[PDB]
Design a protein around this ligand. Structure first.
Ligand SMILES: [Ca+2]
Ligand SMILES: [Ca+2]
Ligand SMILES: [Ca+2]
Ligand SMILES: [Ca+2]
Lengths: 510, 510
């Protein structure tokens, strides 16, 4: 019914602004596009429906930490005046009050969720991800039943990856190049949109850099010469992912663990509380999650930015054919062949890496990924009727070639956030005990404000340099206190979660 | 050929003291006993052949640490005079020289292997175990090919386990009951055979306690009423193991981590170096591995002690029938039906738990398990011809019901020893750095003898109480130094090994 299959997909697949408002059609795609193309959406369909429960919990989190501080303002004023020492050696009557508590307005949306909301939420995602991956494993068996009733050389890349890990250099350059663009020496508007430049300065850059590799790995496999032609994508995707994986997440890891650390600068409290970009960004504090929130914020939303290119790039090629034009398959000769399925999943799993891996930075991470998918489903299936004049109807099944690859990213989901979730909200649940050991417990966690902050910082240059207090040398050893505690979490976390996650694919897959 | 099948198994299966001296027969059992009974031995066959390479490495270890100290005596005299302070506050002119270095003769076979030999060897076993489990996974496919060419309610147990974990109490009782038996207040002969009493006092006890559960879980499943009759053993074995698992390994965990720790006793160096069983076992030191070596030593060898009961218990029932006797299947009416396959594997996996789980205490652990198997194979198959007059010839395949269960124990193999391998040989590889930081490295690890030992002990009551030195309160914080390091190992270990082990079932199973 091409008068219908078009229009039924023309008309039951052009919601294109939000939901269809009716349902989600699957089986009919299985008749028109075959098995493979349809089995994409049936995955992309399940990927959305599972975000909803976890997405909503995000809004339940923001409402938590906000309303956990919106009503009795518990950790605002005590938190709005812990930074007000942060520039004391910097004041010295000269440049005294510039940004001492400037972190406060920036400290809120971080310092609002950490212990109860973030440290919780990751445990649901990892438990969720196993729920998801276990769910799809079975739901794939369902549609597998319907069709099953109706089925009648290597070291060269190792140098290439090390090439990619030099991309950290590339982020640093334009990060150093924020000065030549606007140079905002302010607190209200200069903090945000200063880094957001180099982000958008850079986050554009990876985009053009992305399809570079697609011509790279495509030929870089040809040196391998895979015997079975069908297994070419295996050596293709498996190469194509790892490239694009570390191509994308790498800046975040630089802004996740490495940026704050690795800070060697002598000179004590006389010499520390000023030496920071020549005192024009934040003499008080960094609050790296803000940089970590933001840079994911774009990447969560830049999946919409580049999204229009998915419709814009193909229609833009019409300018080429139309230009040659003035300067039933008859008209069908003037549209690109499909040749594009792995980019379809590939857009998703680079999205899936954000939902699960970096999930203790901001809990709303599922939510932005849910907004795109409603567009992502509606854009793509649009692109199959609107564009892609030649469906192959390959009519294979069994998406497992990705099922490991998506599942593997689930396997990373526990270590990474574990360090994220450990090294940012674990001064507090043990700093109850150094200071408030006598009669000050969980109702007295608002006591370590000036005490824990009386020193240089909280990080590696936070506890070591305390010698001129009383006399690095004789005092950097309380550093060993927490750095066991940070560690002690992970050995508690990944073991439980990897076991708790072991529940889900233990009774549910059967 | 019953005139041959008997005699061929009568004669090619009564080596019964050592090897057959010829070969190992498998396929013929597959003809006589069928598929199931034979597929046991084909497992038990592979379980031995894989111990040999790992067994030998054990002897290569003892030879290592011994000959690493047998020739230049490196860590004997320096180690024979670290304990010679251990009773200094205990001497005080009254009861001075009793057992100050008594640990020395006991310290040798422990303090001989630790850093290079033990910390190595576990990495091979875990890598070995995955090699084994990966090997059998494929070798099972081999014999699977031959036969495949020729195939033409729950919370109640949770209370029961908690009942079992009270068995730690049971070990403590007769452990307290060593005084009423001989009471050896000596160092040469009193140290060993004092604990060995309560071991043999207890290690007998679990034996009679074992088959108690077999009547327990057998009925305790009947309340479940499994629908499929064949899946009864599943709810049977899976219950039967976990009971017998924690029934056996539990004393070791008490003597592994919990015994040394949990020691709260105030009074400083004036009050510490004596208060130990009223000063009659070892005022110097514990060296818990000795207790840990010994109690495994019996259990490695008690698989031979109870072994003769496997032949002794059945023939002992002949005293009952013969007594009624004087006080071709004709004579066949007077022998017990088989009804015993799960105990067959069950003897093994309780053995396998010792090879892999507790493998950093003494590396020879595979070796004692290899001596039994040559007897275990020859005893059992003897028991099928000699006894068990009624073979069923069930003629199923596919041992996977245990393949998880044996593999699961492999999964525990990495955490447990990791703490064993961490909390016993990791003062040393970082105690190079507190004391010998200037010009004393790996060639100067013999410098921390008196220094690291100058304090109370090395354990939790080893570093905290140092206040009367200079002034628990002000000094228990170097405790945080190593206790990060102990932790830092595990988060390094189980991740690598679980990945390194991930290699083996990644190219080899295919
Ligand atoms: Ca996108
Ligand atoms: Ca797309
Ligand atoms: Ca035995
Ligand atoms: Ca036996």
């Amino acid at each position: 019914n091409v008068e219908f299959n078009d229009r039924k997909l023309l008309y039951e697949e052009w919601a294109s602004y939000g939901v269809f408002y009716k349902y989600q059609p699957i089986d009919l795609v299985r008749k028109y596009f075959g098995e493979k193309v349809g089995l994409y959406f049936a995955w992309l369909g399940a990927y959305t429906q599972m975000l909803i429960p976890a997405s909503i919990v995000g809004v339940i989190v923001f409402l938590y930490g906000c309303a956990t501080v919106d009503e009795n303002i518990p950790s605002m004023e005590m938190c709005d005046q812990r930074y007000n020492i942060t520039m004391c050696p910097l004041c010295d009557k000269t440049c005294s009050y510039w940004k001492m508590s400037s972190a406060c307005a920036t400290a809120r949306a971080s310092h609002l969720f950490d212990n109860p909301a973030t440290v919780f939420f990751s445990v649901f995602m990892a438990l969720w991800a196993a729920t998801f991956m276990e769910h799809w494993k079975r739901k794939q068996m369902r549609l597998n039943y319907r069709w099953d009733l109706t089925g009648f050389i290597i070291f060269m890349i190792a140098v290439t990856f090390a090439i990619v890990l030099g991309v950290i250099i590339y982020r640093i350059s334009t990060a150093a190049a924020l000065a030549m663009n606007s140079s905002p020496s302010v607190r209200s508007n200069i903090r945000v949109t200063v880094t957001a430049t180099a982000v958008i300065i850079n986050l554009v850059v990876i985009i053009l850099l992305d399809e570079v590799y697609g011509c790279i790995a495509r030929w870089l496999t040809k040196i391998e010469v895979p015997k079975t032609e069908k297994s070419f994508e295996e050596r293709l995707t498996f190469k194509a992912f790892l490239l694009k994986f570390v191509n994308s997440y790498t800046p975040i890891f630089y802004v996740a663990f490495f940026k704050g650390r690795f800070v060697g600068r002598p000179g004590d409290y006389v010499y520390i509380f000023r030496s920071f970009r020549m005192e024009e960004c934040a003499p008080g504090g960094c609050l790296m999650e803000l940089c970590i929130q933001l840079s994911i914020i774009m990447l969560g939303k830049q999946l919409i930015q580049n999204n229009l290119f998915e419709i814009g790039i193909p229609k833009m090629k019409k300018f080429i054919r139309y230009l040659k034009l003035r300067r039933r398959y008859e008209v069908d000769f003037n549209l690109e062949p499909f040749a594009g399925l792995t980019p379809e999943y590939m857009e998703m799993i680079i999205q899936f890496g954000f939902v699960t891996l970096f999930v203790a930075s901001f809990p709303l991470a599922p939510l932005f990924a849910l907004l795109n998918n409603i567009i992502e489903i509606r854009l793509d299936a649009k692109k199959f009727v609107t564009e892609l004049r030649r469906p192959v109807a390959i009519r294979a099944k069994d998406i497992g070639i990705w099922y490991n690859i998506l599942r593997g990213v689930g396997k990373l989901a526990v270590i990474i956030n574990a360090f994220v979730i450990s090294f940012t909200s674990d001064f507090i649940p043990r700093l109850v005990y150094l200071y408030m050991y006598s009669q000050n417990g969980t109702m007295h966690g608002f006591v370590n404000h000036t005490l824990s902050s009386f020193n240089v910082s909280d990080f590696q240059n936070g506890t070591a340099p305390n010698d001129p207090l009383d006399l690095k040398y004789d005092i950097s050893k309380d550093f060993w206190a927490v750095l066991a505690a940070r560690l002690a979490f992970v050995i508690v976390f990944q073991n439980l979660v990897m076991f708790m996650s072991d529940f889900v694919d233990w009774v549910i897959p059967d």
